[PDB]
Enzyme design. Structure first.
Site, PDB file in Angstrom:
ATOM      1  N   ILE B  17      19.927 -40.696  26.860  1.00 12.10           N
ATOM      2  CA  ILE B  17      20.591 -41.170  28.069  1.00 12.10           C
ATOM      3  C   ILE B  17      19.939 -40.581  29.306  1.00 12.10           C
ATOM      4  O   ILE B  17      19.669 -41.295  30.268  1.00 12.10           O
ATOM      5  CB  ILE B  17      22.091 -40.827  28.064  1.00 12.10           C
ATOM      6  CG1 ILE B  17      22.766 -41.459  26.848  1.00 12.10           C
ATOM      7  CG2 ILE B  17      22.746 -41.268  29.369  1.00 12.10           C
ATOM      8  CD1 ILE B  17      22.840 -42.956  26.919  1.00 12.10           C
ATOM      9  N   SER B  19      18.713 -36.359  31.288  1.00  4.38           N
ATOM     10  CA  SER B  19      18.818 -34.904  31.275  1.00  4.38           C
ATOM     11  C   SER B  19      19.882 -34.405  32.245  1.00  4.38           C
ATOM     12  O   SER B  19      19.652 -34.328  33.445  1.00  4.38           O
ATOM     13  CB  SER B  19      17.459 -34.222  31.526  1.00  4.38           C
ATOM     14  OG  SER B  19      16.764 -34.791  32.626  1.00  4.38           O
ATOM     15  N   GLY B  20      21.057 -34.085  31.710  1.00  8.03           N
ATOM     16  CA  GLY B  20      22.127 -33.522  32.510  1.00  8.03           C
ATOM     17  C   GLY B  20      21.961 -32.020  32.657  1.00  8.03           C
ATOM     18  O   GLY B  20      20.869 -31.475  32.467  1.00  8.03           O
ATOM     19  N   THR B  24      19.632 -32.240  27.145  1.00  7.80           N
ATOM     20  CA  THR B  24      19.329 -33.661  27.124  1.00  7.80           C
ATOM     21  C   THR B  24      20.424 -34.446  26.422  1.00  7.80           C
ATOM     22  O   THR B  24      20.878 -34.080  25.331  1.00  7.80           O
ATOM     23  CB  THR B  24      17.977 -33.960  26.446  1.00  7.80           C
ATOM     24  OG1 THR B  24      16.916 -33.363  27.199  1.00  7.80           O
ATOM     25  CG2 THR B  24      17.761 -35.451  26.379  1.00  7.80           C
ATOM     26  N   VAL B  25      20.829 -35.538  27.057  1.00  8.10           N
ATOM     27  CA  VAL B  25      21.967 -36.311  26.595  1.00  8.10           C
ATOM     28  C   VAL B  25      21.565 -37.589  25.871  1.00  8.10           C
ATOM     29  O   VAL B  25      20.775 -38.392  26.386  1.00  8.10           O
ATOM     30  CB  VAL B  25      22.896 -36.664  27.773  1.00  8.10           C
ATOM     31  CG1 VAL B  25      24.077 -37.474  27.291  1.00  8.10           C
ATOM     32  CG2 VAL B  25      23.363 -35.395  28.471  1.00  8.10           C
ATOM     33  N   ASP B 130      28.085 -26.974  38.970  1.00  7.61           N
ATOM     34  CA  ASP B 130      27.131 -28.065  38.906  1.00  7.61           C
ATOM     35  C   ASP B 130      27.768 -29.402  39.227  1.00  7.61           C
ATOM     36  O   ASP B 130      27.208 -30.443  38.886  1.00  7.61           O
ATOM     37  CB  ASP B 130      26.504 -28.139  37.503  1.00  7.61           C
ATOM     38  CG  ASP B 130      25.482 -27.033  37.253  1.00  7.61           C
ATOM     39  OD1 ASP B 130      24.894 -26.525  38.239  1.00  7.61           O
ATOM     40  OD2 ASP B 130      25.261 -26.679  36.076  1.00  7.61           O
TER      41      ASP B 130
HETATM   42  C1  LIG Z   1      33.501 -30.815  27.162  1.00  5.62           C
HETATM   43  C2  LIG Z   1      32.390 -30.995  28.197  1.00  5.62           C
HETATM   44  C3  LIG Z   1      31.243 -30.102  27.765  1.00  5.62           C
HETATM   45  S1  LIG Z   1      29.869 -30.134  28.885  1.00  5.62           S
HETATM   46  O1  LIG Z   1      30.071 -29.240  29.986  1.00  5.62           O
HETATM   47  O2  LIG Z   1      28.766 -29.515  28.189  1.00  5.62           O
HETATM   48  N1  LIG Z   1      29.446 -31.635  29.423  1.00  5.62           N
HETATM   49  C4  LIG Z   1      28.786 -32.555  28.589  1.00  5.62           C
HETATM   50  C5  LIG Z   1      28.495 -32.350  27.253  1.00  5.62           C
HETATM   51  C6  LIG Z   1      27.833 -33.360  26.530  1.00  5.62           C
HETATM   52  C7  LIG Z   1      27.478 -34.560  27.183  1.00  5.62           C
HETATM   53  F1  LIG Z   1      26.843 -35.551  26.543  1.00  5.62           F
HETATM   54  C8  LIG Z   1      27.773 -34.734  28.521  1.00  5.62           C
HETATM   55  C9  LIG Z   1      27.401 -36.054  29.190  1.00  5.62           C
HETATM   56  O3  LIG Z   1      26.486 -36.152  30.001  1.00  5.62           O
HETATM   57  C10 LIG Z   1      28.260 -37.263  28.758  1.00  5.62           C
HETATM   58  C11 LIG Z   1      29.420 -37.185  27.974  1.00  5.62           C
HETATM   59  N2  LIG Z   1      29.895 -38.423  27.814  1.00  5.62           N
HETATM   60  C12 LIG Z   1      29.126 -39.315  28.439  1.00  5.62           C
HETATM   61  N3  LIG Z   1      29.203 -40.670  28.546  1.00  5.62           N
HETATM   62  C13 LIG Z   1      28.315 -41.418  29.234  1.00  5.62           C
HETATM   63  C14 LIG Z   1      27.240 -40.807  29.878  1.00  5.62           C
HETATM   64  C15 LIG Z   1      26.263 -41.646  30.644  1.00  5.62           C
HETATM   65  C16 LIG Z   1      25.875 -43.004  30.232  1.00  5.62           C
HETATM   66  C17 LIG Z   1      24.993 -43.773  30.947  1.00  5.62           C
HETATM   67  C18 LIG Z   1      24.456 -43.365  32.033  1.00  5.62           C
HETATM   68  O4  LIG Z   1      23.576 -44.252  32.690  1.00  5.62           O
HETATM   69  C19 LIG Z   1      22.392 -43.670  33.233  1.00  5.62           C
HETATM   70  C20 LIG Z   1      24.715 -42.186  32.526  1.00  5.62           C
HETATM   71  C21 LIG Z   1      25.588 -41.305  31.900  1.00  5.62           C
HETATM   72  C22 LIG Z   1      27.171 -39.418  29.763  1.00  5.62           C
HETATM   73  C23 LIG Z   1      28.056 -38.647  29.063  1.00  5.62           C
HETATM   74  C24 LIG Z   1      28.441 -33.741  29.218  1.00  5.62           C
HETATM   75  F2  LIG Z   1      28.761 -33.853  30.512  1.00  5.62           F
END
Ligand SMILES: CCCS(=O)(=O)Nc1ccc(F)c(C(=O)c2c[nH]c3ncc(-c4ccc(OC)cc4)cc23)c1F
Ligand SMILES: CCCS(=O)(=O)Nc1ccc(F)c(C(=O)c2c[nH]c3ncc(-c4ccc(OC)cc4)cc23)c1F
Ligand SMILES: C[N+](C)(C)C
Ligand SMILES: C[N+](C)(C)C
Lengths: 246, 258
Positions: B17, B19-20, B24-25, B130
């Site tokens: 998806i 890099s958050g 990497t997501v 963040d």
């Molecule tokens: C309990 C929280 C733990 S954490 O602090 O570590 N955060 C965490 C953990 C793991 C993740 F995968 C994510 C994360 O980024 C997404 C999670 N559920 C998503 N659902 C959808 C898109 C997404 C689709 C399409 C996009 O289009 C470019 C962009 C984002 C992202 C996520 C995250 F924020």
């Protein structure tokens, strides 16, 4: 016509996905894709041509092409199809940089060829086939799209550049280019003057080393500069099915 | 956290998806759709593992509708975090890429849910650090979910969302989270990022860091309600001590929305 019309009250247009032949995700008895064509308040003539094309799409049905669900006229011409949760082949190969095992590469090529063969058996020329129009659905099937509106560069055949000039054979060359993408992970020439005159063609030395010899050769056949020398999709498809078993 | 471990045999990692924060997501499958964040760690040392386990320890106890639901973690082949999937992608993507145009009421709703998420995290002693539109997600069910708040103590031990005192240094605090939220409000009410005309980073840092440059509030919508603009400005105060807390931010919003 009428029975395939999706009035604008029946469909929720959602996030803008991108451009093709302009695409949104949407809702209509479940997830869909909605392509908004660049027409509002069509003239009778545009409406007519549009109804004609919808006439073709009405009668198209194959696991490897986008399923046609209906059209809209207000506030804008549109075409609705099933949603493909796996994005496009272009996105997988050149963006998220997914690396498929060769089994999967061969599979994608095969499904694409099945859809293309179907289109051609139906007298539908695609004219626009490319990795961007090849969508991956959740069930792991592949769906060709953007073949609507028939009667209306990296993937272009030399004759299509040096102007029909489109034909079934030019579709075949596009498919050759897709095979190149699949087996090099890259786009070709990564111009018009040189490809058109046949002194420049995709660099086949670049293709993967484990690409089966019959796939490489078929790619080369599909990419021949003189179109009469290209194999039809029925033979393209049979050749892929043979090599995948071999 | 044995009970929250998800071994690699149970998850199908799918498409990348982006890099958050911290990793990497990818989209994945685990009893349905999930997101999995792969952290930049394989073969963790006992110390990395322990730190990671403490963080899981916090995450497993967090639960709020305006933050990603924690589903579990993996240690092999790589450290990973698994959460619920958000079909609507990110606020960032909506406002800045696909240029979705929200009605003011949804903008206010998005600000509100975010405040509720942030309020929740702060009540839980969790500092985000963040917070930005890139990690504010839109779920299928039209809720907003905050992410990237995992691993607080590890961050402990994006310039556009950074408070001045954070730029001109650990100067992170609840108040700098508040400044970040203010940047999200700016994004929501202006449809744009701040300092858009400034193509040079070290310029933004030097000037914002020193208090002579700040987001241009004249760019906010005509239809943006006065108290929202005011709150946005309170949140963006250069002196961290003059920013409201999220309990106050949330009440102000709940109130101006009604
Ligand atoms: C309990 C929280 C733990 S954490 O602090 O570590 N955060 C965490 C953990 C793991 C993740 F995968 C994510 C994360 O980024 C997404 C999670 N559920 C998503 N659902 C959808 C898109 C997404 C689709 C399409 C996009 O289009 C470019 C962009 C984002 C992202 C996520 C995250 F924020
Ligand atoms: C019978 C076919 C008629 S047509 O020839 O005109 N083609 C047609 C019609 C309408 C459409 F909406 C689309 C179309 O583009 C998609 C359709 N279903 C999708 N499902 C998923 C992604 C997709 C997500 C994300 C991406 O990431 C950028 C890329 C593509 C696209 C589509 C289309 F091809
Ligand atoms: C007729 N169709 C449903 C196959 C498009
Ligand atoms: C228990 N929970 C944090 C996963 C909700």
């Amino acid at each position: 016509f009428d029975d395939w019309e999706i009035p604008d009250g029946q469909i929720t247009v959602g996030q803008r996905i991108g451009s093709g032949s302009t695409v949104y995700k949407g809702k209509w008895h479940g997830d869909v894709a909605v392509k908004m064509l660049n027409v509002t308040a069509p003239t009778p003539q545009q409406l007519q041509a549009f109804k004609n094309e919808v006439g073709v799409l009405r009668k198209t049905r194959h696991v490897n092409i986008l399923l046609f669900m209906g059209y809209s006229t207000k506030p804008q011409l549109a075409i609705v199809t099933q949603w493909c949760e796996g994005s496009s082949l272009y996105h997988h190969l050149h963006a998220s940089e997914t690396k498929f095992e060769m089994k999967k590469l061969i599979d994608i090529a095969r499904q694409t060829a099945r859809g293309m063969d179907y289109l051609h058996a139906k007298s539908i020329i695609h004219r626009d086939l490319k990795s961007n129009n090849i969508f991956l659905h959740e069930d792991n099937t592949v769906k060709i799209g953007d073949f609507g509106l028939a009667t209306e560069i990296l993937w272009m055949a030399p004759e299509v550049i040096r102007m029909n000039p489109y034909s079934f054979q030019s579709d075949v060359y596009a498919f050759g280019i897709v095979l190149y993408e699949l087996m090099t992970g890259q786009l070709p020439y990564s111009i018009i003057e040189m490809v058109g005159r046949g002194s420049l063609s995709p660099d086949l030395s670049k293709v993967r080393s484990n690409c089966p010899k019959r796939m490489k050769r078929l790619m080369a056949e599909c990419l021949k500069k003189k179109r009469d020398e290209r194999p039809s999709f029925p033979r393209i498809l049979a050749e892929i099915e043979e090599l995948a078993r071999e």
